[PDB]
Amino acid sequence: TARILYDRLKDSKGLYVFTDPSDASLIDIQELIAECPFETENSTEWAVTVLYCKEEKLPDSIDVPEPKSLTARAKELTIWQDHKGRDICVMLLDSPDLEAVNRKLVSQGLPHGHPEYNAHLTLAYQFENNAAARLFIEECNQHLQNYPLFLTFDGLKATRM
């Protein structure tokens, strides 16, 4: 039932909206990555960005989404690179729910910080892609295909920045 408290934030410079995995989904993610050979963000850090908005003049009002359930399918793990070209392990999410929330925010004058919204959950921000890590990612993606994993998120949480 966590929700975007827009009017408390309407006068901020920028808007960050994220959602947190449910208790059950936290346990599901932990069991998914049980055999991971590299260190990962801990369970308190796992969050899914829904809006990264650097607009300094936010709209005065909006139609706030307030979805009733937030679901996503854990599609796969893949490797991204950060500013300094360091490897990042992220969990790609297939989520019509989160796409819809992001679209609802962007269409009302809240621009997202990337040309397309890519729902994902970052699992490791600094990551040595070695044979063990690659085997882990491969087996996890095969597991994600053989056993569909759906995640649920509890609310929408908004902060400045």
Ligand X SMILES: C[As](C)(=O)[O-]
**Which positions lie near ligand X, rule CB under 6 A?**
20, 44-47
Nearer to ligand X, 133 or 158 (CB): 158
25 touches 149 (CB < 8 A): no
Task: Report which residue's Cβ sits closest to ligand X.
Answer: 47
Nearer to ligand X, 33 or 47 (CB): 47
Closest by CA to 14, choosing from 66, 47, 52, is 52
Nearer to ligand X, 20 or 97 (CB): 20
Closest by CA to 124, choosing from 116, 132, 115, 133, is 133
Least distance from C-beta 44 to ligand X, angstroms? 4
Closest by CA to 41, choosing from 49, 50, 33, is 33
Least distance from C-beta 107 to ligand X, angstroms? 26
Least distance from C-beta 138 to ligand X, angstroms? 27
Nearer to ligand X, 48 or 58 (CB): 48
93 touches 75 (CB < 8 A): yes
Least distance from C-beta 20 to ligand X, angstroms? 4
Token readout for 23 is 């208790």
